[PDB]
Amino acid sequence: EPMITSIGNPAQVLKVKETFGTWLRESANRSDDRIWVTEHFSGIMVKEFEDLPALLNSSFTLLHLPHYFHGCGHAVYNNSLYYHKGGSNTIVRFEFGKETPQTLKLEDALYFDRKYLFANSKTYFNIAVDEKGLWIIYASSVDGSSILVAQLDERTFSVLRHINTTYPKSKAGNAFIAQGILYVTDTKDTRVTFAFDLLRGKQINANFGLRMSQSVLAMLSYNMRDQHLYSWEDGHLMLYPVHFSS
Numbered sequence: 068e069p070m071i072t073s074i075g076n077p078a079q080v081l082k083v084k085e086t087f088g089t090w091l092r093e094s095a096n097r098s099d100d101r102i103w104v105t106e107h108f109s110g111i112m113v114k115e116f117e118d119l120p121a122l123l124n125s126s127f128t129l130l131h132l133p134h135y136f137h138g139c140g141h142a143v144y145n146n147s148l149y150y151h152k153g154g155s156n157t158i159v160r161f162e163f164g165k166e167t168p169q170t171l172k173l174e175d176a177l178y179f180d181r182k183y184l185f186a187n188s189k190t191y192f193n194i195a196v197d198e199k200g201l202w203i204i205y206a207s208s209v210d211g212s213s214i215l216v217a218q219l220d221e222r223t224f225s226v227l228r229h230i231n232t233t234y235p236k237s238k239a240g241n242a243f244i245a246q247g248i249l250y251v252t253d254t255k256d257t258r259v260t261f262a263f264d265l266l267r268g269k270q271i272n273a274n275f276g277l278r279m280s281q282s283v284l285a286m287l288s289y290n291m292r293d294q295h296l297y298s299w300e301d302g303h304l305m306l307y308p309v310h311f312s313s
């Protein structure tokens with residue numbers, strides 16, 4: 068059971084003007100160099116870059132999505148974009164290059180009226196993929212607070228388990244998932260201060276630094292392919308190395 072015990076210094080890949088956005092790469096065992104970007108809290112377009120030099124030179128192809136996205140909690144896995152359909156409790160899986168979009172409903176989830184999972188990034192849902200599964204982090208519309216995690220079946224894009232962490236969303240700045248462990252940041256998004264073992268269904272101790280900057284953190288996402296954290300911090304696109312104890 069490998070645990071993160073510290074985070075290394077960030078490497079900045081690009082500075083853009085936009086406060087909020089995402090930048091994402093493939094994590095499946097698919098040596099794909101493409102980068103996908105969204106800008107702002109909502110929209111219908113994704114920018115596809117062929118590789119990092121393309122991103123550095125603002126050379127993209129615009130992809131029109133079948134449904135508007137909201138927030139900065141998306142993920143790419145197996146040539147597909149997973150994202151929150153704005154104004155609904157629907158999550159979309161949009162497969163690139165063929166458009167076979169699938170959807171699923173999270174009936175018990177907050178999704179509008181600024182009752183955010185992560186207020187700092189105006190995000191209601193955070194899709195995350197890692198070594199142990201495909202996950203969706205969200206907050207309960209039953210109590211308006213508790214952070215829940217759905218574990219998905221990849222083939223059918225359906226929810227197998229709902230996992231209640233019992234952690235209040237008011238205490239969470241953002242989060243990521245690595246080796247089956249949910250790591251949650253403080254409200255200032257400077258330290259990881261809470262963790263939860265998603266397979267054993269139990270809290271586990273975690274307290275370590277993420278970063279020194281308190282600039283607005285829009286996106287925080289683990290990639291199992293290179294074991295780095297990807298972030299968007301007030302227009303600064305960063306990569307952090309991660310240190311596992313095992």
Ligand code: NA
Binds near residue numbers: 140193241243286287
């Ligand atoms: Na996140």
